[PDB]
């Protein structure tokens, strides 16, 4: 690494909404970062819901009734 052409570095605590906490290095000088996703893949549930959201023939029938 060079002398000072890069930003500073300091410990960083990343706290999530559900209560989870991570510790890692970053560039934020505040030392604490609030995030909206914990160590759990909400992507999984989002995909599980939107794979069901699909469907056009079932919708046409569900509307048809006859």
Binding of other proteins by 60 (CB under 8 A): yes
**Is 41 assigned to a binding site?**
yes
Closest by CA position to 14, among listed 45, 36, 41, 46 = 36
Binding of Mg ion by 34 (CB under 5 A): no
Task: Look at residue 29 and give its three-state secondary structure.
Answer: coil
The option from other proteins, Mg ion, none interacting with 19 (CB < 5 to 8 A, set by class) reads none
The option from Mg ion, other proteins, none interacting with 41 (CB < 5 to 8 A, set by class) reads other proteins
Task: Look at residue 61 and give its three-state secondary structure.
Answer: helix
Positions at the binding site: 16, 18, 38, 41
């Amino acid at each position: 690494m060079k002398t000072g052409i890069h930003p500073e570095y300091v410990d960083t605590t990343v706290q999530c909404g559900c209560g989870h906490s991570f510790t890692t290095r970053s560039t934020k000088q505040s030392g604490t970062i609030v995030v909206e996703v914990c160590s759990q893949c909400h992507p999984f549930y989002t995909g599980k819901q939107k794979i069901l959201d699909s469907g056009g023939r079932v919708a046409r029938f569900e509307k048809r009734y006859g």
